[PDB]
Amino acid sequence: GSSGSSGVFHPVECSYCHSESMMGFRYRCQQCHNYQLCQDCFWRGHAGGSHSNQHQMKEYTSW
């Protein structure tokens, strides 16, 4: 990554794919500790030992 601290601060960035473009949204899994994804991540579908592909995501407006 690479950016300056003279403008944008804590912009819309994913947790995994850490996207930059402003297209997706904040999608927080249903039942989980810390699982947030964006439109893309969702479209493709992500998961792991912790998060299960059978976990739905909710749309929130925080980031």
**Residue ranges of the binding site for Zn(2+):** 14, 17, 29, 32, 38, 41, 51, 55
| Nearest of 54, 57, 51, 55 to residue 39 by alpha carbon | 57
The footprint of Zn ion on residues 26-55 (CB under 5 A) is: 29, 32, 35, 38, 41, 51, 55
Half-sphere exposure of 10 (CA within 13 A, CB side): 2
Told to check if 14 binds Zn ion by CB under 5 A, we report yes
Q: Are 54 and 32 in contact, with CB atoms under 8 Å apart?
A: no
Residues lying near Zn ion in the complex (CB under 5 A): 14, 17, 29, 32, 35, 38, 41, 51, 55
